[PDB]
Every structure is written in structure tokens, then in C-alpha cells.
């Protein structure tokens, strides 16, 4: 009588037919972030585990998301403006003025270049689900739909008319507008999609990083009693230094039993909605310059070195952060390092690394008329708000620029021009921001013992190059000495042409690498760092180590995602459980129709 | 005598400067939140007082 074993197996089929009913369900979602930086729009795709469950709705599991593709390099939104600015208000628009009224003409103009650069985005980012999805993960990814969040970095923020928001109403209008023909469920909604601010970029770039090196979590890493008698409980966190095209950004957790100056404040993370209440709380020193973007400071660097007599004589500026053979015209235009072993400078208006800047230093705009100081900060560096905007990216009194490759010079005049300038750039006092001025002030006021995570393209390639050439070790720790007796032999090459083109050749018959367009001016990024890791020496509280980073490994030791501020755009929205909830899966795709 | 306080209501929907700051008296809890909102200019000089 095997009559118990059958009646049993009628017993578990309807406890597992239960349990499935009472349980949660897990479905994956795929996630796009749109990285619209100053020159390039690029795609990023994510995947995300969501559970569902009994009277609780649908969730994220933050420590899920993983990137799956990083799309194309398209034209900068910039570009969409520029192009509708050219046919439509002149190309002369740059320089003349021009009645912004008018322009409310070329609305459907103005969507139709927009549409155009998102169809490509479009068609990129269905590539990349397509290319990267199996079928089964299809039929979850197309049936949740898929929020998109399309962020502008630097580039578009400049306008300062009616089409800078203009244009973000079109682009919502065609994300949420997606061809039926794939089937995948693109959407978005103000708040998704928008403009974000350097300071912004920092505190995202910051939840990124403990994120994915797993500091960030809902679990308190030390607990502590105040004065009161409440415990108050905090995370180990790690701080950021992020050197991107248009600025940097030094985001960090604020030393504990430290009190800021009036002046300045912590940036709480809790109080800014971009941590819930759940996670231990997050008070930062939050910093972005401007002037310390590798654009920016590029532009500004040749304007300052330039106009100093010291290394200015008839008509031939000495550049110290420039190799011995290497010469260009004098202006801050974008250098094309030809295979000639010549430089070409883009004069356009439009190509000059001073524009920013320049845009930003103006009697028709901003601040300049409302602090004294403003305008003050403006004339030193020669640009003299009142003149026009060619006159004021000009280097006067030069014709060309001569590499000296002495790096004990260039670091003198990066910490003269760009880290401790004698008049600093106007505080920025929004939410995303402490209100600090320089970098000195940082690390004088509020140094903290928190480790260090150096990151950013440009800022790695100065590492690297020096590992590379067996000057730096590969166990290079943040050694100040180390580094700048590394940098000054690889600085002191000069330019030798070969068949193959141009070549960086070392002193000693070291070796040599090639001469290029990204590598010419690298010295100064070296010196940057040295002046940056200086500063940090020389705070009360040192961080407990410093390291450069491109990508953080996961548990598997591949990286899950990639370092920026992509992470912490989605973690901000998906962490809000019920915020989330209600946009991601009851608005939804639906609430286009 | 020690310094001279100059305090008004923000103008409605004006764009304030990215340098200067309106003062909530809520975020500020110097008024509860079932109060009407009231943003502020907010300024005190030392040199403006009488002495
Ligand atoms: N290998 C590199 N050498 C020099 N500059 C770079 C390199 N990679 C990226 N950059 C620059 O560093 C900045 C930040 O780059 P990324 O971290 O790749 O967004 C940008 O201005 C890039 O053009």
C-alpha cells in the first residue's frame, strides 16, 4: 500500500501551487540612462532584479543593477541648439545678438533635430537589449517597460535663453514616443529626465562608488551615542575626487565631531532625497570647479600662463607643461596633433576650451554686475567682461606656444593658476553644494580621515603612462615624491618625428610612445595631481589611503557597472520604494496611453 | 546701535541669483509648516548699525 506516498504527492502539489501564491516573484527590468555630456550623447543600458510581492507591490534590488552596454558616442545635445541656431537665427549668433522671441517660430524645427540625434539613440539602445538579452529575459524586459533618464552634464547649460528647457520638453515628448516595431517600452517624466548641476554629478558620482564597492547599505557600519543619549549610526564611506571634461568634483563623508564654518554646510544626503530614510545617514563636503574640468582648465591654463611676463617674449609663450619640440598656435582652441608632427588649433568660437568661461565672465549675463569681486576674478584672468567674446578667449600680444617639458614649473603654475588662485571663482551655494571656493579652504577647514577613490579618464592616463614606462611602481600608493620625480623625467621627452608619425621620447633612451591629440598636454594632469595630493598632505585628518580607480569589481570580481554618475541617478529614484513604485509600474509606459 | 536688519518677502516667482539664497522660515523652523510658506531677503549689517 504505496497508497501514503501518492497521497502525499497530492499534499505538496497543493502546498507548492500555495506557496507560490503567497510568495514573491521575481521579473528582471532593463534601465537606460542617457549620458548627455558636454560633446557626446551616449546610451547606457542596465538590468535590474524586480521583486513582486503579496499587498507590497513591486521593488528593485538595488545590489542587482548591472550594466549591460554602453552605446555610441553621438553629437553632443549642444550641437542640436547650435545646428537650430545656425539655420535659424544666423550663424552670426555666437557673437551678434539675437531676439530670443523670434525664435519661438522654429519650435517644430527645433524637434525635428532633436528627433533625429534620439532616433539614433533609439535604434542604439534596442542594438544593445537585442544583442545582449535572450528570449526569455525579453518577454519580462518588454512586459515591465523601461524607464529612461536622459541627463545633461556640461554643454547645454550655457544658453541662457527659452530653448535650453525648451528642448528637454521635445526630448521627453519623443522618449516617450518610441516606435512599436521593437517592442520594448521606453518611457520618462520630468524628473527622470533633466538637467544636472557639476555638484549633482559629484554627490551621484559618490553614491556610485559605495555602492558598487558596497560601503552604502541599509546596515549601519558603526554605531555612536551623542550627548543627548540617542544612538547615532553611520556607514565607512569613501570619498571621491571625479576630474571629468568640464570640472571636478571632490565629494567626501564629513569627519565626525567636526563643525563647519557658518559659511559652508554639509550636504545630508536624507535631507536632499537622494538617500531614504533607512540608510545610516550621509553628511559631505560636496565640491565641484569649474575651472579644474580638463577642458576648462586647459583653456584657462594658456589664458593665465600666457598674459604672465615670465614666460611670454616676443610674440612666444614658454609652456612648461608643454614637451620640449612640441609647438602650436597661441590660442585655447582644440588641438589636433597631425601626423605631420605638426599641431592644428581649431579657431572656431565654438571649439575654444576658454568658451565656458568666457560665456560665464560677461556684462550681458550674470553675477559679474552683482559682486564686486565677480568681475574682479574676471579681469585677472584677462577677460574683460566688457569686450566682446572673441577679444576675451584671446591671447594678446602671442603668436605661438613652445613646450619646455620642466615639470617642477608646470606644477608651480598649476597651483598658481588653477588650484590656488589669488582671486577664487564665485561659491556656489545650491542644495547639491557645500559653498567651499577652492581646494585649499577644502583641506584647511574640512579635511576628513575617510579613504580617497581618484578617478576620471585623464586622471588615470597621468597613473598609467608612468606605470607604463617602468617610472612609477605598480604598488604606487599616492606617494607625493614618488610621483613627481616620475613626472619629471616623463616630461622632460621631446618630440621626435618619425615615419610612423610623432613620438614622446624619453630621456636615458628610456623609450618612447606616440605623440597624439588626448597624450600632448598630459604633464599638466600630472602636475594636477601632485598639487591636488599636496593639499590633501597638508589637511589636519588624512585619508586613510588614496586610490585610482576606473572600475570597481563585484562579487564575481567583474564589474557590475562602471564608475560615474549613471549608478546613482538610478538609486536615487529606485530607492523611494513607493515613489518608485507609483511612476515605474502604475503610471508606467500606460500613461502615455 | 549694532547693526541694521533688512527683511521682506521674496518677490513672487523671481529668479534669485545663484550666489544669494531666499530664507524659508519653515526649512528654518521658525514657522510650522501650517503656516503659509514664507520665503525672505534676509540681511544684517554690522557697519548699518548706529554706533
Ligand atoms: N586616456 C585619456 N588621456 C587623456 N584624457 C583622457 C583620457 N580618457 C579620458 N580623458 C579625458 O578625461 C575627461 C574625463 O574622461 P572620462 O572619465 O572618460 O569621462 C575628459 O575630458 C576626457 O576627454
Not at 613626472?487 to 624619453?506: H, K, N, Y
Amino acid at each position: 500500500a504505496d497508497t501514503e506516498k501518492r497521497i502525499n504527492v497530492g499534499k505538496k502539489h497543493l502546498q507548492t501551487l500555495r506557496n507560490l501564491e503567497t510568495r514573491c516573484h521575481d521579473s528582471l527590468q532593463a534601465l537606460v540612462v542617457i549620458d548627455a555630456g558636454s560633446s557626446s550623447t551616449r546610451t547606457n543600458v542596465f538590468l535590474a532584479k524586480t521583486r513582486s510581492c503579496p499587498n507590497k507591490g513591486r521593488s528593485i534590488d538595488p545590489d542587482s543593477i548591472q550594466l549591460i552596454g554602453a552605446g555610441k558616442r553621438f553629437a553632443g545635445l549642444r550641437v542640436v541648439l547650435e545646428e537650430w541656431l545656425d539655420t535659424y537665427a544666423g550663424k552670426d549668433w555666437e557673437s551678434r545678438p539675437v531676439d530670443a522671441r523670434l525664435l519661438f517660430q522654429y519650435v517644430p524645427q527645433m524637434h525635428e533635430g532633436a528627433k533625429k540625434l534620439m532616433q539614433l539613440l533609439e535604434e542604439d539602445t534596442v542594438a544593445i537589449l537585442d544583442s545582449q538579452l535572450n528570449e526569455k529575459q525579453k518577454v519580462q524586459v518588454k512586459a515591465l517597460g523601461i524607464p529612461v533618464m536622459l541627463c545633461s552634464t556640461a554643454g547645454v547649460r550655457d544658453f541662457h535663453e527659452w530653448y535650453r528647457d525648451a528642448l528637454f520638453v521635445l526630448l521627453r515628448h519623443l522618449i516617450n514616443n518610441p516606435s512599436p516595431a521593437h517592442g520594448y517600452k521606453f518611457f520618462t517624466n520630468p524628473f527622470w529626465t533633466r538637467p544636472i548641476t557639476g555638484a549633482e554629478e559629484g554627490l551621484f558620482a559618490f553614491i556610485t562608488l559605495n555602492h558598487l564597492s558596497r560601503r552604502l547599505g541599509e546596515d549601519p557600519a558603526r554605531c555612536m551615542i551623542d550627548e543627548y543619549g540617542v544612538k547615532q549610526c553611520r556607514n565607512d564611506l569613501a570619498g571621491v575626487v571625479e576630474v571629468g571634461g568640464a570640472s571636478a568634483q571632490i565629494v567626501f563623508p564629513l569627519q565626525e565631531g567636526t563643525v563647519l564654518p557658518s559659511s559652508v554646510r554639509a550636504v545630508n544626503l536624507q535631507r536632499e532625497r537622494l538617500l531614504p530614510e533607512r540608510y545610516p545617514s550621509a553628511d559631505v563636503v560636496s565640491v565641484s570647479f569649474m575651472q579644474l574640468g580638463m577642458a576648462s582648465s586647459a583653456g584657462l591654463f594658456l589664458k593665465e600662463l600666457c598674459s604672465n611676463d615670465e614666460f611670454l617674449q616676443g610674440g612666444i609663450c614658454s609652456n612648461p607643461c608643454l614637451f620640449k619640440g612640441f609647438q602650436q598656435s597661441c590660442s585655447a582652441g582644440e588641438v589636433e596633433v597631425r601626423p605631420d608632427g605638426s599641431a592644428s588649433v581649431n579657431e572656431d568660437v565654438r571649439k575654444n576650451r576658454l568658451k565656458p568661461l568666457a560665456t560665464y565672465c560677461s556684462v550681458n549675463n550674470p553675477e559679474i554686475s552683482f559682486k564686486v569681486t565677480n568681475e574682479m576674478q574676471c579681469r585677472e584672468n584677462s577677460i574683460d567682461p566688457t569686450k566682446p567674446l572673441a577679444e576675451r578667449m584671446k591671447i594678446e600680444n602671442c603668436s605661438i606656444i613652445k613646450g619646455t617639458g620642466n615639470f617642477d614649473k608646470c606644477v608651480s603654475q598649476v597651483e598658481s593658476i588653477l588650484v590656488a588662485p589669488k582671486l577664487p571663482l564665485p561659491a556656489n551655494i545650491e542644495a547639491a553644494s557645500s559653498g567651499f571656493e577652492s581646494v585649499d579652504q577644502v583641506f584647511r577647514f574640512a579635511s576628513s580621515t575617510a579613504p580617497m577613490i581618484v578617478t576620471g579618464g585623464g586622471m588615470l592616463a597621468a597613473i598609467n603612462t608612468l606605470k607604463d614606462h617602468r617610472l612609477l611602481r605598480s604598488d604606487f600608493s599616492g606617494d607625493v615624491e614618488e610621483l613627481a620625480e616620475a613626472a619629471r623625467e616623463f616630461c622632460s621627452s621631446e618630440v621626435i618625428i618619425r615615419t610612423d608619425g610623432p613620438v614622446i621620447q624619453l630621456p636615458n633612451a628610456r623609450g618612447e610612445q606616440k605623440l597624439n591629440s588626448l597624450n600632448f598636454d598630459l604633464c599638466k594632469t600630472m602636475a594636477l595631481t601632485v598639487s591636488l595630493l599636496r593639499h590633501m598632505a597638508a589637511g589636519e585628518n588624512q585619508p586613510s589611503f588614496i586610490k585610482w580607480e576606473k572600475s570597481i569589481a563585484g562579487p564575481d570580481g567583474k564589474p557590475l557597472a562602471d564608475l560615474g554618475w549613471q549608478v546613482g541617478v538610478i538609486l536615487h529614484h529606485v530607492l523611494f520604494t513607493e515613489e518608485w513604485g507609483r511612476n515605474a509600474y502604475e503610471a508606467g509606459y500606460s500613461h502615455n496611453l
